[PDB]
Design a binder for these strands. Sequence first.
RNA 1: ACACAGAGACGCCCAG
RNA 2: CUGGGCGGUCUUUGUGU
RNA 3: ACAC
RNA 4: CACAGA
Length: 1566
Amino acid sequence: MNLEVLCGRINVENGLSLGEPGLYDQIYDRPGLPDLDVTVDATGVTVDIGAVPDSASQLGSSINAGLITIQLSEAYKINHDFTFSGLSKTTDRRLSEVFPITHDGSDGMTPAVIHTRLDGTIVVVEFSTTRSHNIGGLEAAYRTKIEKYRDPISRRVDIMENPRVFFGVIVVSSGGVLSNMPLTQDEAEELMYRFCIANEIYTKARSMDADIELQKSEEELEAISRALSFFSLFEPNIERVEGTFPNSEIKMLEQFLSTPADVDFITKTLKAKEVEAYADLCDSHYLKPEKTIQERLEINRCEAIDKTQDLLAGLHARSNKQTSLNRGTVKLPPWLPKPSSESIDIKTDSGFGSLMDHGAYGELWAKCLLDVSLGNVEGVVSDPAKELDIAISAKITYRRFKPALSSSARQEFSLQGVEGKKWKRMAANQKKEKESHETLSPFLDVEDIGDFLTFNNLLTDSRYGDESIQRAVSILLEKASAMQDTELTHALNDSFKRNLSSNVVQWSLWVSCLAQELASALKQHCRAGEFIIKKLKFWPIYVIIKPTKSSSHIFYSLGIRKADVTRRLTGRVFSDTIDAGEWELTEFKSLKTCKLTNLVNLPCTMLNSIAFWREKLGVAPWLVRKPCSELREQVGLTFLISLEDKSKTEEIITLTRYTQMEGFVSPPMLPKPQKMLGKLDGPLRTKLQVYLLRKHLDCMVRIASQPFSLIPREGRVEWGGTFHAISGRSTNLENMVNSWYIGYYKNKEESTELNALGEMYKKIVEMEEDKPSSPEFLGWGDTDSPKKHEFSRSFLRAACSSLEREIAQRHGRQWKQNLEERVLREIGTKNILDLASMKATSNFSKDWELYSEVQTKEYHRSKLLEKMATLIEKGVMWYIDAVGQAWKAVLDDGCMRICLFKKNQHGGLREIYVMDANARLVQFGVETMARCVCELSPHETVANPRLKNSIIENHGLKSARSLGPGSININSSNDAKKWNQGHYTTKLALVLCWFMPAKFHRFIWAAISMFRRKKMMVDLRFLAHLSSKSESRSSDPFREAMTDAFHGNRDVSWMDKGRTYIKTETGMMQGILHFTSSLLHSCVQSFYKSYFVSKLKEGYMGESISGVVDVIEGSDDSAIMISIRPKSDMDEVRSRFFVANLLHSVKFLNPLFGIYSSEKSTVNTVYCVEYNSEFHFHRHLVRPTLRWIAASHQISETEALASRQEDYSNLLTQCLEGGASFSLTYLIQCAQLLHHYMLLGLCLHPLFGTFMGMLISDPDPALGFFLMDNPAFAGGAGFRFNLWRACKTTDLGRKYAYYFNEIQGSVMVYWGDRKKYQALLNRMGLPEDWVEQIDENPGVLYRRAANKKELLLKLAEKVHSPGVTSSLSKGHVVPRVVAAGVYLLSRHCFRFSKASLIKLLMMSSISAMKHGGSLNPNQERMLFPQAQEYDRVCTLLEEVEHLTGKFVVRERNIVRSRIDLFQEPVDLRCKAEDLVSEVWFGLKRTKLGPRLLKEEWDKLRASFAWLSTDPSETLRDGPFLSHVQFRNFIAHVDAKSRSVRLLGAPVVTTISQVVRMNFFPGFSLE
RNA sequence: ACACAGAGACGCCCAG
RNA sequence: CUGGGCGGUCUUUGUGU
RNA sequence: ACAC
RNA sequence: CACAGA
Ligand SMILES: [Mg+2]
């Protein structure tokens, strides 16, 4: 630990060098903490020190024993003194010794230790310590130290003799170290250990006396005093709590904390559970008696075959037992008409008779065509002339007709649902309605799907390159890519245009246009017998539409002449059409609002799929080949999932992951993928579902027969024999892993019908009927064979003690006294305005409890800011002032008063719980306490987001350190089932009260007791229909149970008669107690870790195995990693058997804590582990790129045309950092461009040609023009970078220069006319002169509110914010946004800071002749603060502009790699908000002295020269009228750095290296 | 056609 | 069985990061 | 965008 | 004047 040795390995070159910083974790094991006795005297602070326990943990050599004194005047820096002693031997120096005198007042600063080497270099080191657990605090301290001295050093680096100076920073915390100096892990560990000692000393010293610390600010002192008074004076009426809520005796907590654990009971139970787990292992894995590996695999195959046949036979008995069907998976025709110019060519004039005698559809279509040919055509094709007139100078006219249909044709239509409510009592309708409820047989003949998936023609070229829609897209793309004109861009554009002419994309284009037509026509209405006829705009296809109500189905039938169908998609998966002579017709299918999204997004989805799988198979995006049939299978499967769009199919595909991860299990265990048949049964309703289930069962038996081969080709580990789960084709690991996520193409945002809420209610109440009768094992005593909800007190206390051990070992032996202070501070500092959010709250009370009184009323939810505004207007400012009344209200009730709804997710059947105001207020405090406690835990990853990347990676270094090279790693990924609903809440209350300072005990106990009488409100329409029918007659038991409970036949415990709600005592809810559940899981993991370590220490037969144990856990996911080191091949088998036994008993020990292990746990896999959808295959971290690629169209509604590109950029960056190469990301962006122009009206509006030809001359964002990125850096740089680079090459800054000098001498479209927002503002009653009031008192924008009026102004400003502006937007963004493409370029929709887009383009072009000058740098800074790094990066990317390179045999070492591409420039050291507030008001917000800040103030003056010390005079000089935008721009000017993390080989050279490598995998660009 | 181990939707409101 | 109306229409969006 |  | 910094 020597400063000379530290400095002797610094490669100083040229003048000042500022080497890149780096981070060190707490990787190595640390010994015990020595004894510390502290007595603080007026003479000084006297400390005695024991001795560090000597072991094979040499860490702790710098600590010496004996008595140490510290003076009282210097006792406020014990942390900084004691940590860095030993690196201090020659005192402190000034900026005068080795540096000259520049006569500026900066001569005199003392930078810790200044050292000059024998060569003559000068290296200055600076030290800092921080008590901040997150890495943000270390980053902040590092930055403030590196900005305190950089100017005084770069000032004198020019006077002296051609200097070579290095500036060094070392920042030390309890967690880690951030230093830009070279350093060793051991040096880091030593510094952190010393800091732990020093902080313990400081805490003990500051405890006894009270003058050691310096002065806390008045705001902090007030906050702590306020919270402490609240917790001293809070009395929650424990007698009433015991009377009201069940199992709420405080005696339970007292006895839990007083009675110790029963160690004899613990060890006896541990022996019993080990024996039971060993017996289960031998029985279920056929280990005894004495069979070989193939002889056991041959039995495993037989068992899997038996289970599969049993499941098939079970499902077949509940079907209609049919073996052939006539359904089709794709409900759309296979037509591929050639796109041509537009004219209504129906006048075949011979088809008007051949249609008339072909059936009901023939009659309908003949009537329609005859009426159109006789009559007018308005509505069928939109009129350009009148629309152009209205644009230059929104009810839309549609063509409606009433055919004279007969009763036979009407009945035949109604069989398909067209007007089937008035025909629902006939014979055929009732028969078909009964027959629609049956499920298919597992033995149905689905081979058309099997042939289609391999032998289609989806990827064939359609030869439709030179058509209208292709020409439009190509024109816009070339204009967008004109500025970055290079051979690279030309190659990628040519590849995209090749993919745009394939058969599937040509199909998806007209499918998407039809879906957009339906989305627009959803909101119309028709009378009885009315229909709507439409043409399809570049395609000769006619559609008849029957809308009902826009919240229900819409029916459509398609018609095309046979001469126009040039080509067809081949296959037998399509529904069959009607031949009517010269026409083809279709039989009235239907759609909904929620099922239109996939059809709108289909062309872009198919384009992305083609590009992605071509990249994954190794085909470069500039070569032309033939499809390899694996490409066909993957793309066809994507197609079929997208078009079918059903939850069951998505769920059958998703489960393949858990059956195929079972092939990584190593000996002595067998792969058992047959445990996933528990989730596989259920009703089958489509042929595609039958096919997928059969393929999945084949995959299961194949995996059970043979595991994945593990071969050491280099020392790195690679697996062989992998395959696609559905196709069965052999592949590699990455393609197999990505194949598990194909089901994510199904539309997540799915409408739930009222038919399917019983499943959610069933999942909620399935455990309540199981609650134990006696409360003995709910916290009082010990049991060894626990029931469903019970747990053992001794084991709970053992786990708590173990986690406390680890907490003390990391944070020192006074962690509780620091935790108390942190919790008091964070409770006292909060106000109501922090709570007031845009979030739903329940109105359910004791007025909606009786369905007799409810029927006429309609239940609605409110938003949280309404109730919070009520509180603020009452006279409540602080959260402490609100909890006291919220709890009293809750205790006056006896309920929790929840309402429910369903979540949209790619998972299962997740339900959502919504609370009310008082419940939210009470829960806030306990959640903040639990979060503060979880932030200390060293293996929890909810309060520590870096630990989910740190632990797994550092395990290898720790194992190498403690065992040497060549060690076997053995893992276990664990998942928990019924996580919520398995937890009784007394458990969480006890575990949280174990870790808290005993003044919070009563509040925590009373706050958590209220979860034991919940009342959840069911849906009123569901209740109406359930009350309509007295008897249930259903085969599912839950239906009749609910009916009889609500009507009073039987008695269940969760529903009363005539009520509107469901009661439940057991179980927490999903997400309400996130941190408490995480803390409990951390305690359990710590118990397992100590247990495994002790077991390894006393190995088999008494000999000791040497090993390393690592654990990690979140909320319900966890992982265990063990590394062993055996001596010989005889020892290896027995050590691995011992480890397998150790990892197998987790599922047997879990029930003791109230946790149940799921069937999705992959136990005993050697060189792999998965924790949170991240798959660590030895040294080949894999992510599923397909998950984020399938979500690159989920845009937001936005408000301005120029904020759509920001959303597209966010999605693109997600895709790139998910593991996509730059060329792939550029192709994804081409697809996003097509999506943007389609929502702007490409396939709807007739005037898009004129608008596009008039925009291609004036390429401006916010007039709809799309800006493309550079292919070499596709996703790295954002929209601001693209705008900056576009204003400097084409005529945009020219336009901006017109707009600038006209100011010195943005085209919003509203969606609802702000009706809901305006009504929300009307109920609040806020002052409308708030702008004037904050103009006359500006302290509200920088200083936290201090009275009711200022808090009112704070809220009033908050509720006019851009964030609050768009939150009343409901779901299904794509249909609602694409519906407005009908009235976009021709109606008065924009209010520029109303007119149509054509009109605004005309105004801008009329100003295009007065355009003057290009942009100037001084205000280029004002528009773009980061305008220097932009030029540096733009200049770096011009070396790569061609398509020359070589294919290299790729190395396989994949890791996250952070890239900083835009840094922070050299401005005033602080933030502008901080500095301005500091000078303008009395607020010590910035961290500089009194003589300081004058330099920063004068340097800030250079940018403006009008800014002054007075806010009032400052306001009247600048170009800003009001402080409300003054503050906005002050926050804006502080520029933000952009950083991106990547996937690739470990690594301004970084930018060039990633540009070279990650253009295409295995290709070295230039 | 959608939803569902048969709980729903297939238009609603007003005036005649 | 005639006429007139029906959109940011609610369903619908919880806790954390 | 991820989890619960 | 210069120090330390949840
Ligand atoms: Mg897991």
